């Protein structure tokens, strides 16, 4: 093990990760605009 | 092999000389179901010696005692029967027919070749499949029919029996998956000459789809009418025979 | 030999012992399910039995028998026409894609592909030119088969006089019967020999290595005469590494070792049927092609690895996966019944009994439960099965999301409205033998004015294994392909291949020289002439775009707007990252066009776009 | 004979002709007995057997086979179909009959025949006159 140191499930996790990454910018921009509105 | 059963069916009226009804000691505190004797007689006369034949029963309460459920109509429906089991089309839309006003669906009536003191697995399965989500108080009237005699027994089903028929969505012939006789309880049935019931039948008259599996739709949305029911091997159940010859 | 012995042959089969019971059971039932065993000889016999029983004449009109394979339909039609002693087409005949051999419209017995029959149900749903239908080899459960099971279950109401026969295997005869109204099964014995079966007492670590180990043991623990071996394996690259490994073991310590796979050129496929000497042993290393498509004599031994390369469509990702998966119990038994053909035999299973009991499902999953269905749903809307489609009686219903995704695809293409109802564009597309994108692109190519090129490109896109890439010669195979290279795409490189093929007078020797499969090319031309016939049936003009190949690429956007990607590649709508398949003209330690459209997405060793075309984004919102 | 089978042996193929050229009277006498005795089920059956002897066809056959001028192809198609005769009757338009046959040309003629096929509309009501007598 020291020297040596599902596929579709991992791809569905990569799909979820890429969606989550791209949606975060819109969430942050919504917070930034919310802060301007609150100000 | 139908040819032998067709011959045998001609004599079913002789079986009605021995009518036994399953009776326990009476209980005024629970329902009693009253079957008109003419309905029973005709139902046996149209049935088959081997194959299970089935129908719905519709009825209502008398004024004298609310718990006395008179059966008024037998609704015979598109079905495909077997020994020991029967495949029944859905609970019929009959409401646009005359005189259906104030009828309950009371449940189902059917023939069997085995004699029992409880509901069998195919009964509990088909009874659950028909009534579980719709009207759980509906009875089964089972009829043992055998040479010389018919024996009638009525049952309520427990929620344990309903649940078991939900767990057993289909039955392979002897799965016996913790089936219990105690899933069913005796129901008070009386057979009466004092009253006469009638038949509703499908509008194309034919109800036995044994020779006609392709036109049986078990989901099917069939139209119905009052009318005299055809026997199991009537010509109209058997059109191919008359096309071959 | 000769036209006398032919009848004794027919009488000597076990189907003849019960011939009168067969032709009576079909009189007393409109539907029959038949378990015919391998040595029943069912396929040639019963068709003759029913014609001779009289239905096939102008009394009833013709008999049809479906096959799943083209070559099967022709071969059994030749056999039965010769058993009936008639020139093929005149009373016995056949009708398959590109090839109708029926010299009269009233040709009395007609063998067909299940797809051909399915095509005919659209033009005549009652099929009134036929008295009897036989579904042969229906245990294979093809898409066309599975559709016809529902279609016939409804149509035989609409025709009491239409007789129906369904062949079945033992895993599913009850299941088939119950669907068809619990109508009677009939079981015929066959003249088949016993096969001894041996599970492995443990899971094997690597089935390739156990396979060669057991091959040498069967070969040399016995003396080398009088008993040949079949070994089942998952794919060409796996198979080719195995021959290499097994030859060396003999040279350390006679044996003849032969490949078979569908991508193998036909001359080398054919030689496996030719004989082997006494004292020498034949051994055959095979894909699933040797389960059913091919039949070998003198095999007495089988080794089964227990895994196969099954395609499954993932509808969520929209992605085919070719997965090395455990086989079904049925499939294991079919492999086992390859021994036992010629004489008593043995099957060695590289897996345990419990893995066969639980880890292997009983039946194989039907194709309809695991493929994209949009060709099917298009056709099943084109014949006016409506929300009747949305509730359609299949034996084994496709997954809800598969249906809804195919509906979404058709709605996207504009074959379907927001309620879910067929558009006239849909009905036109359904008259092509095509997945709907390839009909969309041909109809669009009319208006765009590239029908002429589009015909041959769509033809080439239909065809498997167009280029040949043997084990050591990856460089030479690609070098020959690259003489036809178009810098834009694989798609226009297919055009250059077909043009150069033709300029060489369609030469087979040119095909071989340039490492292209001639079988694939001749099928492409047959498809081109068929699609040209369909266009001339729809009266469409076959306009050429000339050197303005961008017109084709604009048309591709009309059909393939979902099947698009962008460089890291990254899918247009789901956003998953994906790769160009290494065969692509656009692949290498090299080329990188920014925006991409593609013919298929497929997971193999990697999540690959199968073949690649470059695009401008403006066309994607132009067409959709 | 009700099925119109074909026969080779002259003796048997004249036994059958003797049977059918007597059958009508005999069935009509059987029918009369049941109708007089009041037995509904056999009376209805025997009326169909009398009609079958008259028409050389069974109740499962369609009455286009009873219209002597009809084309055979139409009869055979409809006998295959699940649609009841009492359903095909309900058409009032010539084009609709053409569709129902899958023949435009024959729709024109067969519509005429359909409008000739004997048909009844019936209504009934009862009135109690006395306790015992119903009109």
Can you give the residue ranges of every domain in chain C? 1-190, 191-370, 371-433, 434-623
Q: How far is CA C104 from CA C81, C209, D67, in A?
A: 14, 56, 33
Contact B240 C160 (CB under 8 A): yes
Contact D82 C162 (CB under 8 A): no
Which ranges in C449-549 belong to alpha helices (H)? 451-461, 474-482, 490-503, 508-513, 518-537
| Chain C residues with CB-CB distance to B87 below 8 A | 182
Q: How far is CA B220 from CA B91, B216, B238, C155, C403, in A?
A: 10, 8, 20, 16, 23
With contact defined as beta carbons under 8 Å apart, do C441 and C528 qualify?
Answer: no
With contact defined as beta carbons under 8 Å apart, do B205 and B77 qualify?
Answer: no
Computed from CA positions of residues C318, C322, C328, C333, in that sequence, does the dihedral angle turn out positive or negative?
positive
C548 touches chain D (CB under 8 A): no
Rg (CA), chain A: 19
| Chain A residues with CB-CB distance to C314 below 8 A | 8
| Chain D residues with CB-CB distance to C162 below 8 A | 80
Give the bridge partners for D128, in sequence order: D134
Q: Which residue has the tokens 């589009």?
A: C454
Distance, CA of C413 to CA of C344 (rounded, Å): 56
Interface of C with B in 159-178 (CB under 8 A): 160-161
Residue C350 DSSP class: S
Q: What's CA C598's distance to the chain center, in Å?
A: 22
C155 touches chain B (CB under 8 A): yes
| Chain B residues with CB-CB distance to C31 below 8 A | 213-214
The nearest alpha carbon in chain C to B240 belongs to C160
Q: Which two tokens stand for residue B20?
A: 């036994």
Contacts of C69 (CB under 8 A, 6+ apart): C113, C293
Cβ of C392: how many Cβ atoms within 10 Å? 19
Contact C182 B82 (CB under 8 A): yes
Q: Which residue has the tokens 């009518």?
A: B19
Q: How far is CA C324 from CA C233, C310, C343, C607, in A?
A: 10, 7, 32, 15
Same fold, C1-190 and C191-370: yes
Domain extent at residue D96: 59-116
Give chain D as a 3 state SS string: CCCCCCCCCCCHHHHHHHHHHHHHHHHHHHHHHHHHHCCHHHHHHHHHHHHHHHHCCCCCCCHHHCCCCCCHHHHHHHHHCCCCHHHHCCCCCHHHHHHHHCCHHHHHHHHHHHHHCCCCCCCCCCCECCCCCEC
Distance, CA of C369 to CA of C582 (rounded, Å): 30
Task: Give C518 to chain B, closest Cα distance, Å.
Answer: 46
Interface test with C, best of A7, A8, A12 (most C CBs within 10 A): A8
Contact C162 D80 (CB under 8 A): yes
Interface test with D, best of C159, C162, C384 (most D CBs within 10 A): C159
| Chain D residues with CB-CB distance to B245 below 8 A | 3, 5
Q: Which residue has the tokens 């899958």?
A: D102
Burial of C621 (0-12, 13-18, 19+ CB in 10 A): exposed
Contact A15 C321 (CB under 8 A): no
Q: Does D have 3 or more CB contacts under 8 Å with A? A: no
Query: CB pairs under 8 A, 24+ apart, for C87-96?
Result: C96/C70
Distance, CA of C491 to CA of C496 (rounded, Å): 9
Distance, CA of C530 to CA of C412 (rounded, Å): 27
Strands (E), C233-293: 255-260, 281-286
Contact C317 A12 (CB under 8 A): yes
Distance, CA of D73 to CA of C128 (rounded, Å): 10
Contact B209 C181 (CB under 8 A): yes
CA dihedral A12, A13, A18, A23 (to 10 degrees): 100
D60 touches chain C (CB under 8 A): no
Contacts of B33 (CB under 8 A, 6+ apart): B59, B69, B71, B106, B139, B141, B154, B187, B188, B189, B190
Interface of C with B in 50-109 (CB under 8 A): none
The nearest alpha carbon in chain D to C129 belongs to D77
The nearest alpha carbon in chain A to C324 belongs to A7
With contact defined as beta carbons under 8 Å apart, do C494 and C457 qualify?
Answer: yes
Residue A7 has its nearest CB partner, among C316, C575, C603, at C603
Interface of A with C in 1-39 (CB under 8 A): 7-8, 11-12, 14-15, 18-19, 22
The nearest alpha carbon in chain B to C178 belongs to B213
Please provide the DSSP assignment of B73-130 as one string.
Answer: EEEE--EEE-SS-EEEPPPP--TTSTT-TT-EEEEEEEEESS--SS--HHHHHHHHHH
Q: How far is CA C56 from CA C60, C64, C66, in A?
A: 6, 9, 16
Contact D80 C157 (CB under 8 A): no
The nearest alpha carbon in chain D to C157 belongs to D82
Cβ of C123: how many Cβ atoms within 10 Å? 9
With contact defined as beta carbons under 8 Å apart, do C382 and C120 qualify?
Answer: no
With contact defined as beta carbons under 8 Å apart, do C48 and C79 qualify?
Answer: no
| Chain A residues with CB-CB distance to C317 below 8 A | 8, 11-12, 15
Report the CATH number that the domain containing residue D110 is assigned in CATH: 1.10.150.20
CA atoms within 13 A on the CB side of C326: 20
Q: How far is CA D101 from CA C150, C592, D78, in A?
A: 24, 63, 7
Residue C182 has its nearest CB partner, among B80, B214, B243, at B80
Contact D60 B245 (CB under 8 A): no
| Chain D residues with CB-CB distance to C157 below 8 A | 82
D18-40 in b/e form (b: 16+ CB < 10 A) is eeeeebeeebeebbeebeeeeee
C157 touches chain D (CB under 8 A): yes
Q: How far is CA C274 from CA C232, C277, C519, in A?
A: 20, 10, 22
Q: Are strands C307-308 and C92-96 parallel, antiparallel or unpaired?
A: unpaired
Burial of C163 (0-12, 13-18, 19+ CB in 10 A): buried
Contact B245 D5 (CB under 8 A): yes
Q: Are strands C62-67 and C109-113 parallel, antiparallel or unpaired?
A: parallel
Task: Give C467 to chain D, closest Cα distance, Å.
Answer: 50
Distance, CA of C212 to CA of C246 (rounded, Å): 6
CA dihedral C547, C550, C552, C556 (to 10 degrees): 160
| Chain C residues with CB-CB distance to A11 below 8 A | 317, 319, 576, 603, 607
Contact A8 C575 (CB under 8 A): no
C394-414 in b/e form (b: 16+ CB < 10 A) is ebbebeeebbebbbbbbeebe
Q: What's CA C311's distance to the chain center, in Å?
A: 12
Distance, CA of C218 to CA of C500 (rounded, Å): 49
> Domain C1-190, what architecture?
3-Layer(aba) Sandwich (3.40)
Q: Which residue has the tokens 């399910």?
A: C33
Task: Give B115 to chain C, closest Cα distance, Å.
Answer: 25
| Chain B residues with CB-CB distance to C157 below 8 A | 212, 214-215
Helix (H/G/I), strand (E/B), else coil: C183: coil
With contact defined as beta carbons under 8 Å apart, do C76 and C67 qualify?
Answer: yes
Burial of C559 (0-12, 13-18, 19+ CB in 10 A): buried
Partners for B (CB, 8 Å, 3+ pairs)? C, D
Closest by CA position to B196, among listed B42, B76, B39: B39
Contact A15 C603 (CB under 8 A): no
Contact C158 D76 (CB under 8 A): no
| Chain D residues with CB-CB distance to C159 below 8 A | 80-81
Q: Name the experimental technique.
A: cryo-EM
Interior CA angle at D94 toward D92 and D100, to 5°?
A: 90
Q: Which residue has the tokens 């998956």?
A: B177
With contact defined as beta carbons under 8 Å apart, do C203 and C255 qualify?
Answer: no
C162 touches chain D (CB under 8 A): yes
Distance, CA of C190 to CA of C45 (rounded, Å): 13
The nearest alpha carbon in chain C to A11 belongs to C576
Interface test with B, best of C180, C181, C184, C387 (most B CBs within 10 A): C181
Distance, CA of B27 to CA of B23 (rounded, Å): 11
Q: Which two tokens stand for residue D43?
A: 């009376």
C604 touches chain A (CB under 8 A): no
Q: Are strands C307-308 and C325-326 parallel, antiparallel or unpaired?
A: antiparallel
C309-340 in b/e form (b: 16+ CB < 10 A) is ebebbbbebbbbbbbebbbbbbbbbbbbbbbb
Closest by CA position to C342, among listed C290, C300, C283: C300
Phi and psi at D55, nearest 5°, equal -100, -15
Q: Which two tokens stand for residue B167?
A: 């767990």
Q: Are strands C595-598 and C612-614 parallel, antiparallel or unpaired?
A: antiparallel
Q: Which CATH class is domain C191-370?
A: alpha beta
Q: Which two tokens stand for residue C366?
A: 């039907």
Contacts of D36 (CB under 8 A, 6+ apart): none
Interface test with D, best of C124, C125, C160, C162 (most D CBs within 10 A): C160
Number of helical H runs and strand E runs in chain B: 6, 13
């Amino acid at each position: 093990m020291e020297q040596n140191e599902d596929k579709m499930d991992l791809l569905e996790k990569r799909l979820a990760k890429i969606q989550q990454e791209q949606e975060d910018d819109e969430e942050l921009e919504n917070l930034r605009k919310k802060n301007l509105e609150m100000s | 092999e139908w040819r032998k059963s067709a011959i045998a069916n001609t004599l079913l009226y002789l079986r009605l000389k021995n009518i036994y009804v399953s009776a326990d000691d009476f209980v005024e505190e629970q329902n009693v179901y009253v079957l008109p004797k003419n309905l029973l007689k005709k139902f046996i006369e149209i049935s088959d010696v081997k194959i299970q034949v089935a129908a719905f029963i519709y009825g209502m309460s008398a004024k004298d005692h609310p718990k006395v459920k008179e059966i008024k109509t037998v609704v015979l429906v598109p079905q495909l029967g077997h020994v020991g089991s029967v495949q029944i089309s859905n609970i019929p839309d009959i409401g646009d027919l005359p005189d259906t006003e104030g009828l309950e669906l009371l449940g189902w009536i059917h023939t069997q070749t085995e004699e029992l003191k409880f509901m069998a697995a195919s009964e509990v399965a088909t009874h659950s499949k028909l009534f579980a989500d719709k009207k759980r108080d509906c009875i089964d009237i089972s009829i043992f029919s055998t040479p010389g005699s018919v024996s009638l027994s009525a049952y309520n089903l427990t929620d344990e029996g309903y649940q078991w028929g939900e767990e057993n969505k289909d039955i392979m012939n002897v799965l016996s998956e913790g089936f219990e006789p105690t899933f069913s309880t005796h129901a008070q049935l009386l057979l009466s000459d004092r009253i006469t019931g009638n038949f509703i039948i499908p509008s194309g008259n034919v109800w036995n789809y044994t020779f006609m599996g392709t036109a049986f739709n078990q989901e099917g949305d069939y139209n119905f009418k009052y009318g005299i029911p055809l026997e199991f091997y009537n010509e109209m159940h058997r059109p191919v025979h008359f096309l071959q010859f | 030999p000769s036209k006398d012995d032919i009848k004794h042959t027919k009488e000597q089969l076990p189907v003849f012992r019960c011939r009168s019971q067969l032709l009576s059971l079909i009189r007393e039932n409109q539907v029959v399910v038949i378990i015919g065993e391998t040595g029943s000889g069912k396929t040639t016999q019963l068709a003759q039995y029913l014609y001779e029983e009289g239905y096939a004449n102008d009394r009833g009109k013709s008999i049809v028998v479906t096959q799943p394979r083209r070559v099967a339909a022709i071969s059994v039609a030749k056999r039965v026409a010769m058993e009936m002693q008639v020139p093929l087409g005149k009373e016995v005949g056949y009708s398959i894609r590109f090839e109708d051999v029926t010299d009269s419209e009233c040709t009395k017995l007609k063998f067909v592909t299940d797809g051909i029959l399915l095509r005919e149900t659209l033009l005549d749903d009652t099929l009134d030119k036929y008295s009897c239908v036989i579904i042969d080899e229906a245990h294979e459960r093809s898409l066309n088969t599975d559709i016809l099971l529902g279609f016939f279950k409804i149509l035989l109401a609409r025709r009491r006089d239409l007789k129906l026969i369904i062949t079945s295997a033992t895993m599913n005869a009850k299941k088939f019967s119950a669907f068809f109204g619990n109508a009677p099964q009939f079981t015929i014995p066959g003249r088949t020999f016993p096969v001894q079966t041996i599970y492995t007492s443990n899971p094997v670590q690597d089935y390739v290595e156990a396979a060669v180990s057991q091959a040498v043991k069967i070969h040399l623990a016995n003396d080398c005469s009088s008993g040949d071996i079949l070994i089942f394996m998952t794919g060409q690259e796996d198979i080719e590494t195995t021959f290499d490994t097994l030859q060396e073991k003999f040279l350390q310590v006679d044996i003849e070792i032969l490949p078979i796979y569908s991508a193998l050129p036909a001359d080398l496929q054919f030689k496996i049927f030719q004989d082997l000497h006494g004292t020498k042993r034949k051994i055959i290393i095979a894909t699933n092609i040797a389960e059913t498509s091919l039949t070998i004599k003198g095999i007495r031994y089988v080794i089964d690895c227990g895994y196969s390369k099954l395609k499954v469509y993932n509808p969520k990702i929209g992605l085919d996966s070719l997965v090395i998966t455990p086989i079904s119990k049925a499939n294991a038994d079919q492999r086992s019944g390859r021994a036992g053909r010629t004489a008593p035999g043995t099957a060695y299973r590289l897996y345990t009994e419990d893995t066969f009991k639980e880890d292997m499902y009983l039946q194989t999953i039907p194709e309809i439960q695991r493929t994209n269905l949009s060709n099917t749903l298009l056709l099943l809307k084109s014949l006016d099965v409506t929300d009747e489609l949305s509730k359609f009686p299949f034996i084994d219903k496709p997954p809800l999301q598969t249906f809804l995704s195919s509906l979404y695809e058709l709605w996207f293409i504009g074959a379907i409205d927001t309620s879910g109802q067929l558009t006239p564009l849909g009905l036109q597309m359904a008259k092509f033998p095509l997945q709907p994108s390839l009909s969309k692109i041909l109809l669009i190519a009319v208006r765009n004015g590239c029908s002429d090129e589009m015909l041959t490109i769509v033809s080439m896109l239909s065809v498997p294994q167009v280029f040949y890439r043997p084990k050591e010669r990856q460089k030479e195979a690609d070098i020959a392909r690259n003489k036809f290279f178009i810098a834009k795409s694989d798609h226009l490189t297919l055009l250059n291949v077909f043009e150069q093929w033709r300029a060489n007078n369609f030469s087979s020797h040119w095909c071989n020289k340039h490492f292209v499969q001639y079988k694939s090319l001749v099928r492409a031309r047959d498809i081109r002439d068929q699609l040209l016939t369909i266009l001339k049936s729809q009266k469409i003009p076959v306009i050429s775009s000339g050197k303005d190949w961008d017109i084709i690429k604009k048309c591709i956007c009309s059909g393939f707007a979902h099947q698009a990607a962008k460089i890291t590649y990254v899918h247009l709508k789901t956003g998953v990252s994906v790769q160009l398949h290494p065969t692509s003209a656009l692949h290498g330690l090299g080329d990188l066009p920014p925006y991409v459209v593609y013919h298929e997405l497929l997971m193999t060793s990697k999540e690959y776009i199968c073949c690649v075309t470059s695009v401008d984004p403006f066309w994607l919102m132009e067409y959709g | 004979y009700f099925s119109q089978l074909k026969f080779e042996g002259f003796a048997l193929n004249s036994d059958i002709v003797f049977i059918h050229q007597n059958a009508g009277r005999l069935l009509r006498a059987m029918f009369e007995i049941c109708l007089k005795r009041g037995w509904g089920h056999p009376t209805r059956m025997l009326l169909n057997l009398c009609k079958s002897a008259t028409t050389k066809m069974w109740p499962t056959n369609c009455p286009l086979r009873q219209f002597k001028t009809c084309p055979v192809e139409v009869i055979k198609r409809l006998e295959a179909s699940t649609v009841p005769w009492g359903d095909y009757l309900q058409l009032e338009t010539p084009a609709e009959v053409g569709r129902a046959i899958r023949s435009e040309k024959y729709g024109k003629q067969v519509y005429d025949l359909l409008k000739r096929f004997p048909k009844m509309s019936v209504t009934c009501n009862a009135q109690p006159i006395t306790r015992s007598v119903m009109r």
